Ligand binder design. Structure first.
Ligand SMILES: [Cl-]
Ligand SMILES: [Cl-]
Ligand SMILES: [Cl-]
Ligand SMILES: [Cl-]
Ligand SMILES: [Cl-]
Ligand SMILES: [Cl-]
Ligand SMILES: [Cl-]
Ligand SMILES: [Cl-]
Ligand SMILES: [Cl-]
Ligand SMILES: [Cl-]
Ligand SMILES: [Cl-]
Ligand SMILES: [Cl-]
Ligand SMILES: [Cl-]
Ligand SMILES: [Cl-]
Ligand SMILES: [Cl-]
Ligand SMILES: [Mg+2]
Ligand SMILES: [Mg+2]
Ligand SMILES: [Mg+2]
Lengths: 248, 233, 204, 237, 239, 234, 230, 196
């Protein structure tokens, strides 16, 4: 019925896709989520939105998802949409493993999902998924990697980036502090806390309010860990000590 | 916004009428039927010297005895042309005989109104074809020229023009055409008419011409054969 | 008989706080040995292994398809799969092919990932499960295997005695079967380690 | 399934979805192709720079097969779909004909895919144009362009994306037997064409070449800025 | 606006598209049925829109089974499609259950089919009302009428189309329970002549059919001689 | 207005505008006439020619040995319907080895053409037909409309300025049943000629004729073959 | 046929307004409360129960999904009966494969996924309900909420429906982690008393509990007993 | 009837195959090639039923080449072996089974040389050497007798020759010529045919 169809998969007069844009506005308001590549690993750090006192704490994270042995992701935007997509990512990764008997290379996993997102902008008359993702991983072709994908079905690789609230500000701070070819996990962790300290300008930064996951290699095996609150507090403490030095 | 199969108060399908307006955005093509064969001639309409002229193909062979000139939205013509080709080969396969020009034209014309959004397969045609076609060939009725437009109406014509300058070209055709006219005369006549109607100066790279004769198979004129005919014109 | 085309044998056995699982190593096609290091026992967890005998192609398919399902299971759930739950997962996979089955009859051996309690089971080719408190066997020399396990197995065996019993049960059983053998591999699964051995064995 | 007619005619014979697709292509990064004597070259703008970007992951020049590559301008997600469809088709062709595709064959395939997405229910047109290059079995070099409508032509040289009109104008004056007499001058003709439109010249021209039988070579920033200087110091004289 | 789809209620709880379909039936010329002692008789005022048409063109009286007649008003192409649905239903009933479909069941089944076209944007309501008539020794005389909403009731007398009310008021004067079909055809012809507006629509054919003891439970056209007499009676009664 | 774009939308007057618009396609086609005697059914049609050098559009189509049609409206719809008719006829000869009675074929047309008038996103057929046939009940002329209604006719005319042709046919219809064939076709031509501007005449280029009857299979007369029938409009 | 286009779409500010309007149907529903005690869970709800004419026992808002899992909701009752039916079916599909009762969190994930579908799939609106799902497994109690978007959350205690904002601050100033189930039931009913209006009887509230022994509704007589103190 | 053999050394894999295409009592081709290049460093050797063999091997070949085009790098000999296996196994119980027996030979940058054996049932085994066809029955024990893991490529070609001479002597079929190729770090190399 033509009267009620909002026509979600058509061009506007400038060659634009309005839903896609509109989905990108949803993302910009969601929890800030950054990724940082280092020489010995990759990390994700995310603002938590689940922070009311009466919440119960039952999973090992709020917005960090393990995809397969060698890969994880974080998300900004519509949570239920993110659940459908991360489920689909796990399925694609297992289909590839079944067929080839090796892990899916990171970029291939991202591309496979982005093609699904792409389809939702071109046919079927449905709303797109209101999700942007950051993907971290290791494979044998390009080692440690970080990708970003959005509701247009576009992706790229990054050394450091941010999606969600205050993204532009977070990327400026990264442009200025990030040392191409010279970062370590320990210095990326410092930078991530620096960045979240500034971009959560409402208000004072706490371990209850962020989530950090690291992805490293140990004895020929990928290790993916969500940092415990003791460690997050310790990094916050070190960042606060470090800013005391800032003048003299 | 209304559905694609909506009739106007005059009893026409809006989509078909609009498709008919798209034909006017095409280059001019001419067909003439003589007792010695048919010719088809088309303005190429070159938009840059960097474009390769031979990659503009607006006259195509359907089979050895039938050619086709198109005007309008050229990309739309491809499925029509392919259908004509498949059909003539099916007919050869099944009946061991060549298919008449009229029959080819009929078969293609039966695709015309097959569009719509809630009878058909998961992604069937959404709109009519923005193309007009002149089928020129020779069969056992003799030489023959047929015209078809996006309504699926088709008819035999002794001479016809289609595209941007078709009014114009059609008037000159009524003036010059006669039943006993030779094919060489028809060729000259249609190049004279293209020359009038074309925005650019006519030459041997910005037009195409083809013939079909009782003697001889579909033949596209070469650069050199065009130059020869261009001398007098 | 389809099940004897490749031959082969697996078994598993329970001891005190430990389990053992073992397999012959031959990949052959009717009379012809093709290889002598063919894998039939696959990790499904740190302390959980599945052994498959039967048609080699289905041994590989079932292991691979099972792994697909288990990995999705573990990602989705909080956690490592329980032995009994693996059994049910395999049962369900085999019974989906009830009318065109995979020709394999697995055994499972492991320790509960939280309680470390020993578990062993086997299933027929259409997914009927059987848990036992002693041993299970599957392959072209099942009768031979039964005779050895019924005579030698005892309750509450420590890791060393379990290893000797499963090893002697396997070696002597496959030595009465033309199309099983060409080596034996044994995994002993304890709380704090896995011990993997290949046995001195007949090669004819 | 969703069967709405999306591309329909309007009064006067316009197909608005297709026109809007063409607007998408015009906001894409500039891409240029020149057909040499025994080389073909593709160059493309930018797109944004950004030091924190992994360069490898956003190229706009792509192999379709060993003897055919393409650049595009427009919606990059749409392009990826077209590219992959074409790559599948190149393998069917080799499968059933045991020859590599001609450049015209695969162009014609892409074009007809694009046309079908302007006349099928439930779908919008692809918002990309493509420049497709390579060599036919007999060694003849080729450059083709497709647009969202499904129309396609062969070109001696061409540009698509933002600033195509002025890049085309430049090429029209500058494409001569002399400008493509050698490989190096062909390559330089592409760079000169871009350096006209390209913001912080340049820096951010990606460039690739295809030689008869020799398969796709992409140039690196060190090899590009050799050509840049070699043209800049010649334009002082 | 609230009146474009049968899947949209208005704020007062109406389905205007069904009401509009009802207006097409009310624009049509009048059909009547009367049940009597030994059967059911139908009459239709059949407007002749051109002298070029044959006698009998555009019948509005149909046989839907050997024992069941149908009389229609409204859009004639919709009515004919409904006559096909009724036929198919009677045929299927005989195949599945092995005996002639009871009138009431047929009426209820075709009414549910009419009803199904009043729920959805995908389709439109039928622009027709129709009467079904039968007779058997076991069930006696039965006359049902179905409208575009799918409502179905039984009647002693019924009229549909544009002079519906005038027709009913004449039908009410008859003691039809005690009359035979042979008596009632005359009265049907009489009533059609009364409600016919001879100023506004110039020419009409009377169409008559019946089913009763006298036809052995078969629905049949009234024979020509009997129709002509009934017309002559109706005309002279108009005087 | 809000009521005229969907065949599924009734107006508040109990009309369906899309169906009425489809009927306009027939009123703007070129006129055709059909009439019958006791023994023959005849169709006569004016063919419109696009330009002076065009053939003239076919108006009369063969359906089966005992059935032919004349068309007015969308030519593509006319062919689709004609192809349906042809198939229904072949089917009945295949199944029963006898011709499909003309009144049953017409019923099938009414039932087929009604369906898209009631489903969203479909449209009526934009064509009207005159149908000439001969079977056990003698000759017939039927008319079909985009509304899916159909009519059994002593004679009929549809298309542009057909009112004139209809008047002529009413004026002389009492003569038709007793006419020999030549007389009957003459009558068809005179009716058709009423539809023309005063200047213009019936010629061998613009008239097409179809005839079927007891001893004659459906036959089409065009071009030089119409001249016998046109000479002696005297 | 079925409409194949989404009836929920993004607004120019990035909002899915149908989902926000579904949430407004939830906010206008009758109050529900869930409290996770140390040794169990209580779910409690108000009946929007007019009339003495209602047979209060004839339909329940607090429903078993499995022996160990139960649900309550705020919002539209008939929408809720759909989700109860699908949750039951999902729990049984899991049990057939794995031969173990579905973990509470796995049941919530699958139900929440169904609610997500109704925000994108063709020709349908979202569900106008929020679910509170209680369960016991791995030796431990669980309380989850699942909202019309398909988002879900684990709570120690919460309130939904009319006056939920105040309900949550009432619970914030009253819940402790070491609290027992018998006390929790008490505080759950006090939370409903905050926004009641009517005088509470055992016939116009419903209470369900979940512990190691399983999930069940409290009987009218048991509720009456807890209402004596209140 | 068709013979395939492979021998893997420390840093190469040598493979060979007969060059006959037979039908009923006649050789119809004496220069037949049973090897399919999948990638720069992968050969698939395929025998079995007519039609199935080419249709299967070319389908694998196109998909492996597609994988290269989509991803810019090549599938490892092990991945390609498991891809091949997945396809054969997935077809086994379908309406379109493929009756083919294979070897897959390759060289990986990091793993080194590999040789895989597959039967029509889609059982996959990695092996230091292997062979298919009736000729395997007469040559595998020659390989068992003389193969060592460090065997040099010159001695592998000698070992291969012993196998092929044994067919000339002892096998009832006339297989007079064999294709020989080797794969290593630098790709696929054609050796001279071994002929009698
Ligand atoms: Cl994994
Ligand atoms: Cl993996
Ligand atoms: Cl035109
Ligand atoms: Cl599976
Ligand atoms: Cl397609
Ligand atoms: Cl452009
Ligand atoms: Cl009425
Ligand atoms: Cl017409
Ligand atoms: Cl038309
Ligand atoms: Cl009508
Ligand atoms: Cl008319
Ligand atoms: Cl829809
Ligand atoms: Cl239920
Ligand atoms: Cl359960
Ligand atoms: Cl209960
Ligand atoms: Mg043995
Ligand atoms: Mg032996
Ligand atoms: Mg076969």
């Amino acid at each position: 019925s033509r009267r009620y169809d909002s026509r979600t998969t058509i061009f506007s007069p400038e060659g634009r896709l309005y839903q896609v844009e509109y989905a990108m506005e949803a993302i910009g308001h969601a929890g800030t989520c950054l990724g940082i590549l280092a020489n010995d690993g990759v990390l994700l750090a995310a603002e938590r939105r689940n922070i009311h006192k009466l919440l119960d704490e039952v999973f090992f994270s709020e917005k960090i998802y393990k995809l397969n042995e060698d890969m994880a992701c974080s998300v900004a935007g519509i949570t239920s949409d993110a659940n459908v997509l991360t489920n689909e990512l796990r399925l694609i990764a297992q289909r590839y493993l079944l067929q080839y008997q090796e892990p899916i290379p990171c970029e291939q996993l991202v591309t496979a999902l982005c093609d699904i997102k792409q389809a939702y902008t071109q046919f079927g008359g449905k709303r797109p998924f209101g999700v942007s993702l950051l993907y971290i991983g290791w494979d044998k072709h390009y080692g440690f990697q970080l990708y970003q994908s959005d509701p247009s079905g576009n992706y790229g690789g990054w050394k450091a980036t941010c999606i969600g609230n205050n993204s532009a500000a977070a990327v400026s701070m990264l442009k200025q502090d990030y040392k191409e070819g010279e970062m370590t996990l320990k210095s990326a962790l410092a930078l991530a806390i620096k960045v979240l300290n500034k971009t959560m300008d409402v208000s004072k930064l706490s371990a209850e309010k962020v989530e950090i996951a690291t992805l490293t290699r140990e004895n020929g095996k990928t290790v993916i860990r969500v940092l415990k609150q003791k460690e997050v507090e310790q990094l916050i403490k070190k960042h606060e000590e470090e800013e005391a030095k800032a003048e003299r | 916004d209304r559905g694609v199969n909506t009739f106007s108060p005059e009893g026409r399908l809006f989509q078909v009428e609009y498709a008919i307006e798209a034909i006017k955005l095409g280059s001019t093509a001419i067909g003439i039927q003589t007792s010695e064969g048919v010719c088809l001639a088309v303005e190429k309409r070159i938009t840059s010297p960097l474009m390769e002229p031979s990659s503009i193909e607006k006259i195509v062979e359907i089979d050895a005895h039938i050619g086709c000139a198109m005007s309008g939205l050229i990309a739309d013509a491809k499925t029509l042309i392919d259908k004509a080709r498949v059909e003539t080969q099916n007919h050869w396969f099944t009946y061991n005989e060549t298919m008449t020009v009229e029959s080819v034209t009929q078969a293609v014309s039966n695709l015309a109104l097959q569009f719509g959004e809630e009878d058909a397969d998961p992604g069937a045609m959404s709109r009519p074809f923005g193309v007009a076609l002149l089928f020129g060939g020779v069969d056992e009725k003799g030489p023959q020229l047929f015209h078809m437009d996006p309504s699926g109406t088709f008819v035999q014509c002794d001479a016809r023009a289609i595209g941007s300058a078709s009014e114009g070209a059609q008037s000159s055709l009524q003036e010059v055409y006669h039943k006993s006219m030779t094919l060489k005369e028809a060729i000259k006549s249609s190049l004279i008419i293209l020359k009038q109607v074309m925005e650019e100066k006519l030459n041997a790279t910005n037009i195409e011409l083809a013939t079909v004769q009782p003697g001889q198979n579909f033949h596209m004129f070469t650069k050199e054969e065009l130059e020869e005919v261009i001398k007098d014109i | 008989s389809i099940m004897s085309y490749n031959g082969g044998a697996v078994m598993a056995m329970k001891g005190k706080n430990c389990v053992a699982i073992a397999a012959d190593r031959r990949f052959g096609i009717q009379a012809q040995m093709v290889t002598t290091d063919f894998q039939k026992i696959f990790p499904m967890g740190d302390r959980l292994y599945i052994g498959l005998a039967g048609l080699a192609t289905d041994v590989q398919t079932v292991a691979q398809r099972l792994k697909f399902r288990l990995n999705l299971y573990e990602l989705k759930e909080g956690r490592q799969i329980k032995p009994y739950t693996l059994m049910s997962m395999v049962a369900n996979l085999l019974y989906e092919k009830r009318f065109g089955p995979y020709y394999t009859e697995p055994v499972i051996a492991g320790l509960d990932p939280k309680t470390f309690k020993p578990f062993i089971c086997s299933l027929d080719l259409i997914g009927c499960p059987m848990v036992t408190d002693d041993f299970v066997v599957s392959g072209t020399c099942a009768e031979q295997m039964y005779g050895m396990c019924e005579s030698l197995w005892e309750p509450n065996m420590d890791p060393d005695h379990l290893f000797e019993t499963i090893s002697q049960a396997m070696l002597n059983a496959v030595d009465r079967d033309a199309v099983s053998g060409m080596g034996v591999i044994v995994h002993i699964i304890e709380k704090d380690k896995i011990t993997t051995r290949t046995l001195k064995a007949r090669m004819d | 399934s969703y069967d709405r007619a999306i591309t329909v005619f309007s009064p006067d014979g316009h197909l608005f979805q297709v026109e809007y697709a063409q607007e998408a292509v015009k906001k894409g990064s500039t891409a240029v192709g020149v057909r040499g004597r025994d080389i073909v070259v593709l160059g493309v703008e930018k797109k944004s720079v950004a030091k924190l970007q992994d360069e490898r992951t956003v190229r706009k020049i792509c192999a379709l097969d060993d003897n055919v590559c393409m650049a595009f301008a427009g919606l990059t997600a749409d392009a990826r779909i077209v590219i992959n469809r074409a790559r599948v088709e190149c393998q069917s062709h080799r499968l059933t004909v045991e020859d590599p595709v001609t450049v015209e064959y695969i162009t014609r395939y892409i074009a007809s895919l694009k046309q079908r997405y302007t006349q099928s229910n439930g779908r919008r047109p692809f918002g990309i144009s493509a420049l497709i290059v390579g060599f036919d079995f007999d060694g003849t070099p080729r450059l083709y362009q497709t647009d969202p409508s499904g129309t396609y032509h062969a070109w001696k040289a061409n540009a698509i994306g933002r600033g195509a009109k002025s890049v085309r104008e430049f090429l029209e004056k500058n494409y001569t037997d002399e400008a493509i007499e050698t490989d190096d001058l062909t390559i330089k003709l592409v760079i000169k064409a871009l350096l006209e439109v390209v913001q912080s010249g340049g820096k951010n021209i990606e460039l690739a070449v295809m030689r008869r039988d020799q398969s796709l070579k992409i140039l690196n920033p060190e090899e590009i800025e050799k050509y840049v200087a070699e043209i800049e110091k010649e334009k002082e004289e | 606006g609230y009146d474009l789809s049968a899947s949209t209620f208005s704020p007062d709880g109406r389905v205007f598209q069904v009401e509009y379909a009802m207006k097409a039936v009310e624009n049509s010329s009048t059909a009547i049925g009367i049940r009597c002692k030994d059967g059911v008789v139908f009459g239709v005022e059949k407007l002749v829109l051109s002298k070029l048409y044959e006698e009998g063109s555009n019948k509005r009286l149909f046989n839907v089974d050997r024992h069941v007649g149908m009389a229609v008003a409204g859009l004639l192409a919709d009515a004919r499609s409904l006559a096909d649905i009724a036929r198919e239903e009677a045929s299927n009933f005989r195949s599945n259950f092995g005996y002639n479909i009871p009138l009431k069941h047929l009426a209820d089944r075709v009414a549910m089919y009419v009803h199904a076209y009043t729920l959805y944007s995908a389709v439109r309501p039928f622009g027709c009302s129709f009467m079904l008539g039968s007779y058997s020794v076991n069930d006696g005389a039965q006359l049902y009428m179905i409208d575009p909403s799918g409502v179905s009731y039984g009647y002693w007398g019924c009229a549909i189309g544009k002079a519906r009310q005038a027709a009913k008021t004449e039908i009410e004067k008859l003691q039809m329970k005690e009359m035979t079909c042979r008596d009632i055809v005359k009265e049907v012809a009489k009533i059609i002549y009364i409600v016919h507006d001879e100023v506004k629509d110039k020419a009409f054919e009377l169409e008559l059919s019946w089913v009763g003891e006298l036809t052995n439970g078969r629905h049949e056209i009234v024979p020509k001689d009997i129709r002509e007499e009934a017309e002559k009676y109706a005309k002279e009664s108009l005087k | 207005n809000q009521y005229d774009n969907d065949v599924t939308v009734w107006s508040p007057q109990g009309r369906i505008h899309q169906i009425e618009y489809a009927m306009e396609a027939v009123k703007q086609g070129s006129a055709t006439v059909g009439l019958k005697s006791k023994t023959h059914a005849v169709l006569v049609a004016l063919k419109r020619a696009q330009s002076e050098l065009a053939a003239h559009q076919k108006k009369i189509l063969h359906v089966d040995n005992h059935i032919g049609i004349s068309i007015a409206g969308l030519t593509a719809d006319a062919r689709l319907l004609c192809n349906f008719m042809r198939q229904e006829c072949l089917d009945s000869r295949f199944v029963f080895d006898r011709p499909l009675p003309v009144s049953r074929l017409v019923s099938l047309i009414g039932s087929k053409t009604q369906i898209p008038t009631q489903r969203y996103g479909r449209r009526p057929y934009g064509v009207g037909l005159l149908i000439a046939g001969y079977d056990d009940m003698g000759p017939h002329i039927f008319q079909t409309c985009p509304s899916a209604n159909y009519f059994d006719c002593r004679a009929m005319s549809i298309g542009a300025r057909s009112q004139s042709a209809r008047t002529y046919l009413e004026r002389h219809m009492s003569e038709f049943m007793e006419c020999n064939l030549n007389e009957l076709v003459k009558h068809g031509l005179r009716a058709l000629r009423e539809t023309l501007p005063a200047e213009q005449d019936l010629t061998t280029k613009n008239v097409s004729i179809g005839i079927v009857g007891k001893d004659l299979e459906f036959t089409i007369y065009d071009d030089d073959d119409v001249s016998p029938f046109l000479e002696g409009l005297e | 046929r079925g409409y194949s286009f989404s009836l929920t779409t993004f607004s120019p500010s990035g909002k899915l307004v149908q989902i926000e309007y579904a949430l407004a149907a939830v906010a206008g529903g009758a109050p529900s409360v869930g409290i996770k005690a140390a040794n169990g869970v209580v779910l409690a709800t108000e009946k929007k129960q007019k009339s003495i004419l209602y047979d209060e026992r004839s339909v329940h808002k607090v429903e078993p999904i499995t022996k160990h899992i139960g649900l309550v909701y705020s919002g539209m009752g008939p929408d809720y009966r759909v989700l109860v039916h699908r949750a039951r079916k999902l729990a049984q599909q899991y049990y057939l494969v794995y031969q173990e009762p579905i973990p509470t969190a796995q049941l919530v994930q699958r139900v929440a996924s169904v609610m997500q579908e109704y925000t994108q799939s063709g020709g349908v609106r979202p569900f106008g309900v929020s679910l509170l799902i209680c369960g016991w497994n791995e030796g431990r109690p669980y309380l989850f909420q699942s909202d019309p978007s398909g988002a879900y959350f684990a709570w120690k205690a919460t309130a939904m429906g009319k006056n939920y904002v105040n309900g949550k601050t009432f619970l914030e100033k009253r819940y402790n982690e070491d609290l027992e189930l018998e006390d929790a039931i008490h505080t759950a009913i006090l939370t409903l008393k905050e926004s009641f209006e009517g005088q509470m009887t055992e016939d116009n509230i419903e209470v369900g509990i979940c512990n190691e022994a399983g999930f069940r509704r409290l009987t009218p007589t048991e509720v009456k007993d807890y209402l004596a103190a209140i | 009837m068709e013979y395939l053999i492979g021998i893997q050394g420390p840093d190469y894999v040598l493979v060979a195959s007969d060059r006959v295409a037979a039908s009923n009592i006649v050789q119809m081709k004496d220069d037949h090639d049973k090897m399919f290049k999948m990638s720069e460093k992968i050969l698939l050797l395929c025998v079995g039923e007519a039609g199935d063999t080419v249709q299967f091997a070319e389908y694998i070949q196109k998909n492996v080449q597609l994988y290269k085009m989509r991803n810019g790098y090549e599938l490892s000999p092990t991945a390609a072996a498991n891809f091949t296996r997945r396809n054969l196994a997935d077809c086994l119980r379908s309406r379109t089974p493929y009756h083919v027996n294979l070897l897959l030979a390759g060289y990986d940058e990091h793993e080194g040389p590999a040789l895989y054996y597959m039967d029509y049932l889609a059982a996959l085994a990695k092996a230091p050497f292997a062979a298919h066809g009736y000729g395997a029955f007469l040559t595998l024990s020659i390989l068992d007798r003389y193969y060592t893991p460090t065997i040099s490529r010159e001695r592998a070609v000698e070992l291969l020759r012993k196998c092929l001479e044994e067919l000339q002597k002892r096998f009832i079929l006339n297989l007079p010529t064999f294709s020989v190729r080797i794969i290593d770090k630098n790709g696929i190399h054609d050796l001279d045919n071994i002929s009698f």
